[PDB]
Amino acid sequence: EIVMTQSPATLSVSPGERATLSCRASQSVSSDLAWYQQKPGQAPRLLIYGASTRATGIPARFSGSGSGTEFTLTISSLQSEDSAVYYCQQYNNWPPGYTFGQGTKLEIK
Amino acid sequence: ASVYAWNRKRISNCVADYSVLYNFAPFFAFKCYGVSPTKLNDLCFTNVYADSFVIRGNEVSQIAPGQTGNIADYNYKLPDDFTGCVIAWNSNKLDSKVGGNYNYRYRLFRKSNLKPFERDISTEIYQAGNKPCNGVAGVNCYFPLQSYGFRPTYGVGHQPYRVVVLSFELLHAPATVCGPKKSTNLVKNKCVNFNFNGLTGTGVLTESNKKFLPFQQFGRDIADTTDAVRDPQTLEILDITPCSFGGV
Amino acid sequence: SALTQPASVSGSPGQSITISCTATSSDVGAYQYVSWYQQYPGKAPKLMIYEVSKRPSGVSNRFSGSKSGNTASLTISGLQAEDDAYYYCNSYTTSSVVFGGGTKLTVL
Amino acid sequence: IRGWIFGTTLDSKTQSLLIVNNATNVVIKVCEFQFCNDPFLDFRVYSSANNCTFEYVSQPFLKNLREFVFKNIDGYFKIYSKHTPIDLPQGFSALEPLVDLPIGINITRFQTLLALHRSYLTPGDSSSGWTAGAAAYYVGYLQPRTFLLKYNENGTITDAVDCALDPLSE
Amino acid sequence: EVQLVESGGGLVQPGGSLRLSCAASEITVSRNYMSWVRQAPGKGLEWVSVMFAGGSTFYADSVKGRFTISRDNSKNTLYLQMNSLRAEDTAVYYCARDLGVVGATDYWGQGTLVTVSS
Amino acid sequence: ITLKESGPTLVKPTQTLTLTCTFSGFSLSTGGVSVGWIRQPPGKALEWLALIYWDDDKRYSPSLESRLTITKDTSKNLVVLTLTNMDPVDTATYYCAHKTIPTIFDYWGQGTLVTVSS
Numbered sequence: 001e002i003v004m005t006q007s008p009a010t011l012s013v014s015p016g017e018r019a020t021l022s023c024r025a026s027q028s029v030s031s032d033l034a035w036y037q038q039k040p041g042q043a044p045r046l047l048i049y050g051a052s053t054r055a056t057g058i059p060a061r062f063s064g065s066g067s068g069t070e071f072t073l074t075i076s077s078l079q080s081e082d083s084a085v086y087y088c089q090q091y092n093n094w095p096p097g098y099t100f101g102q103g104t105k106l107e108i109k
Numbered sequence: 110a111s112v113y114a115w116n117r118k119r120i121s122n123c124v125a126d127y128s129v130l131y132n133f134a135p136f137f138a139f140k141c142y143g144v145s146p147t148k149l150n151d152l153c154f155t156n157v158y159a160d161s162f163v164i165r166g167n168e169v170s171q172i173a174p175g176q177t178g179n180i181a182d183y184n185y186k187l188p189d190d191f192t193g194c195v196i197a198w199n200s201n202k203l204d205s206k207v208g209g210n211y212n213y214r215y216r217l218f219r220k221s222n223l224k225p226f227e228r229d230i231s232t233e234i235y236q237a238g239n240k241p242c243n244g245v246a247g248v249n250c251y252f253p254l255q256s257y258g259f260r261p262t263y264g265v266g267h268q269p270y271r272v273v274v275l276s277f278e279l280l281h282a283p284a285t286v287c288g289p290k291k292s293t294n295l296v297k298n299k300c301v302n303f304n305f306n307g308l309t310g311t312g313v314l315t316e317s318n319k320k321f322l323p324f325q326q327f328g329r330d331i332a333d334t335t336d337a338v339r340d341p342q343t344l345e346i347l348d349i350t351p352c353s354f355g356g357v
Numbered sequence: 358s359a360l361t362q363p364a365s366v367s368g369s370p371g372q373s374i375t376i377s378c379t380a381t382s383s384d385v386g387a388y389q390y391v392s393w394y395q396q397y398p399g400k401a402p403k404l405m406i407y408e409v410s411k412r413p414s415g416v417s418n419r420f421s422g423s424k425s426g427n428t429a430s431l432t433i434s435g436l437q438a439e440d441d442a443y444y445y446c447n448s449y450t451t452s453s454v455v456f457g458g459g460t461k462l463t464v465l
Numbered sequence: 466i467r468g469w470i471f472g473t474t475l476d477s478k479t480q481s482l483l484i485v486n487n488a489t490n491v492v493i494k495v496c497e498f499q500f501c502n503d504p505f506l507d508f509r510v511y512s513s514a515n516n517c518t519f520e521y522v523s524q525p526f527l528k529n530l531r532e533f534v535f536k537n538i539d540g541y542f543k544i545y546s547k548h549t550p551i552d553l554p555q556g557f558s559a560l561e562p563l564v565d566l567p568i569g570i571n572i573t574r575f576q577t578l579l580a581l582h583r584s585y586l587t588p589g590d591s592s593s594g595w596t597a598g599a600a601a602y603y604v605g606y607l608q609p610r611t612f613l614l615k616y617n618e619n620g621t622i623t624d625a626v627d628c629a630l631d632p633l634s635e
Numbered sequence: 636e637v638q639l640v641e642s643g644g645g646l647v648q649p650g651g652s653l654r655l656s657c658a659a660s661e662i663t664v665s666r667n668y669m670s671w672v673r674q675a676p677g678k679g680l681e682w683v684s685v686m687f688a689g690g691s692t693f694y695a696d697s698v699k700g701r702f703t704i705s706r707d708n709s710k711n712t713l714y715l716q717m718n719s720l721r722a723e724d725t726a727v728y729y730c731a732r733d734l735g736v737v738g739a740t741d742y743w744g745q746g747t748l749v750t751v752s753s
Numbered sequence: 754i755t756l757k758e759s760g761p762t763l764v765k766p767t768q769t770l771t772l773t774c775t776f777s778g779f780s781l782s783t784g785g786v787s788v789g790w791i792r793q794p795p796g797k798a799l800e801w802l803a804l805i806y807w808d809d810d811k812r813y814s815p816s817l818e819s820r821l822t823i824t825k826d827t828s829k830n831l832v833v834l835t836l837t838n839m840d841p842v843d844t845a846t847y848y849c850a851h852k853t854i855p856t857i858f859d860y861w862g863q864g865t866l867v868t869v870s871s
Binding site: 032033034036042043044045046049050055087089091094095096097098099100101102103 | 670679680681682685687693694729733735736738739740741743744745746
């Protein structure tokens with residue numbers, strides 16, 4: 001049970017610019033990760049899996065990076081509808097295992 | 110070999126010393142099933158099979174009698190009444206390379222469980238319920254095998270482990286692989302209890318003067334009294350006389 | 358394995374020789390703090406150099422570090438018989454200090 | 466004559482037995498390889514797939530009268546032999562224990578093995594055969610009997626008496 | 636469309652039982668690594684259970700011994716039985732088909748609310 | 754079999770350049786196996802550089818010896834090449850190929866392009 005800690009908690013950026021969110025692990029998570037965007041009101045949506053591979057359909061506007069014990073998700077240009085919660089899920093032990101985060105609330109203006 | 114492609118071998122017809130192992134390595138994983146490791150070197154077996162392969166760190170526990178998992182239930186399964194044992198020793202000095210050693214794989218997807226000592230090599234693209242993405246990608250066409258991809262930055266849980274599985278047999282065994290023996294150094298000229306390869310008796314041993322034929326192992330006087338024996342080590346013939354006794 | 362150093366090196370007495378402690382691993386960070394330790398024949402490692410191209414006052418002036426990018430080429434000119442010892446590399450990672458696989462230097 | 470084959474059948478339906486001599490060594494194997502209708506006449510081998518369980522090799526068994534006794538009772542098959550200078554001679558001579566093999570195959574039928582130089586080879590042929598030197602082999606069947614054996618001063622059998630042949634012998 | 640639809644959500648008295656159900660379409664579940672996730676109102680998510688393609692299932696520690704996952708393979712659907720609902724287990728439960736190293740969890744379920752009397 | 758070199762792309766005159774060649778498919782424990790280095794000037798032919806046998810007896814090209822101490826580490830199956838005192842002749846590409854006795858350098862790596870100038 002590896003505990004993941006995201007940072008910061010909130011972010012308010014003017015429309016159209018970049019946003020950078022860090023989620024921090026406590027051990028070696030190499031390149032086993034994913035990022036989910038759970039727009040408020042329904043189930044999450046996979047954005048970027050593995051280390052930085054962008055899930056199908058998912059706008060290129062997202063960018064994941066990092067490896068080992070530290071990871072970061074980056075968005076190129078926030079549009080008005082990008083406001084949602086994001087979680088980095090690790091899976092270094094797959095059968096049976098996954099570990100979620102505390103989530104991050106990102107909004108605009 | 111890979112977990113699903115172990116290199117079977119048999120080891121029989123030999124005087125087997127199961128304690129030559131202990132001088133090899135720290136033997137990270139060494140627990141014996143059906144036979145005690147302490148009393149291994151002496152016991153005898155029918156046919157000793159050996160399966161050699163490599164797995165990841167946190168999956169060595171799945172190689173056990175009756176244990177279900179993803180490497181045990183999909184690509185390598187040993188019986189519940191298994192007799193033999195498994196030996197796994199971390200080896201990431203010869204198996205884990207920087208970038209991912211995509212040489213050891215493991216069936217991750219399959220149809221059902223496998224029978225004991227059932228090895229499969231098939232590397233076809235798994236189905237997708239309907240006609241799959243034969244030779245292409247798509248919704249859910251997930252290959253059944255997946256490589257481990259060991260690297261020297263992986264934690265000990267993600268490191269390659271070499272593993273050998275020995276399968277014994279104890280039912281009807283034609284003892285062929287076992288027995289270290291113990292030729293108690295020879296004593297002469299004293300009435301001593303002797304056991305020459307099963308021949309047990311008492312008496313005084315004396316230098317012989319009779320020519321045993323090369324195929325003979327015993328000597329007898331009238332009335333089947335065992336009079337002489339040849340050494341199984343130096344092949345010297347020895348005379349046996351019961352030590353002195355009498356009335357007073 | 359985490360960081361990486363060659364098995365051993367042996368340089369003839371009185372010449373120069375350089376040793377590298379390559380990371381051989383992605384995202385070891387900026388690889389900017391790199392300390393080197395001299396392991397004596399059975400003694401506690403002593404900081405010889407930190408900030409590879411810098412050097413702490415108190416040791417000779419022949420040891421010299423360098424940076425060819427992502428590694429630290431430790432150089433030693435005018436090799437003396439006193440230098441037969443072990444050498445190690447050290448560099449902060451993102452979460453914690455890491456060490457090199459070790460290198461042995463024997464003067465002959 | 467270079468070998469024999471034993472078993473309950475020549476087909477691969479049972480783990481039959483094979484013993485084949487050669488100029489270099491003897492090779493003994495038990496692998497249930499289905500063989501042809503006739504032993505192949507040398508084109509060095511002719512047999513089907515195998516499930517071999519035992520294999521062994523040692524020096525070869527080679528006017529000289531070679532004698533052999535084949536016995537297989539207790540799950541073991543035993544061979545005794547003797548090579549003598551020279552039809553069957555009247556001379557007395559005992560056979561010596563050569564090998565005690567552990568195979569426990571249920572042997573019921575047996576055959577001999579031939580070879581030939583620069584001979585054609587087919588799985589099946591008629592009684593035409595191929596040319597070969599003049600030679601012959603005799604076969605006899607053993608029975609449970611009572612024997613009186615005489616051992617000499619050096620431990621070798623020199624004479625024997627059949628206890629149930631005639632009244633004087635009895 | 637490819638989807639996972641759920642049922643069983645409602646209200647039950649403490650110590651009671653419940654059964655969560657998961658329906659799928661255009662994709663099978665029996666041979667797919669299935670994973671039920673849940674979310675307490677306002678909190679994060681947590682892996683609850685998994686069943687393999689051979690049947691060997693697994694459960695989280697927080698719910699070990701009380702919940703049992705099953706699936707009617709004959710008609711291509713998933714289920715999760717719950718019992719002994721205590722004050723913690725009040726959460727919204729999601730159905731997911733997780734792949735792992737080859738593509739992380741993607742396809743999820745509409746969810747199902749599970750609250751207690753109080 | 755596969756090999757890969759890595760290291761500095763740029764270097765200054767009279768400096769110690771270091772290179773690490775990582776391979777995959779084989780290790781440095783089996784007999785016959787060795788690892789050598791080769792360089793190639795732009796638009797010219799190759800030449801030999803060094804060789805490290807499997808018994809840890811090392812060999813270099815006769816003309817260019819008494820320098821370029823090539824070390825190695827058989828634990829992570831890595832070879833290290835280090836060349837000091839860069840001259841404008843040393844401006845060339847560098848490759849790390851595996852050497853056996855008859856098929857000299859049958860398995861080459863990736864290669865790092867290096868320039869020597871201000």
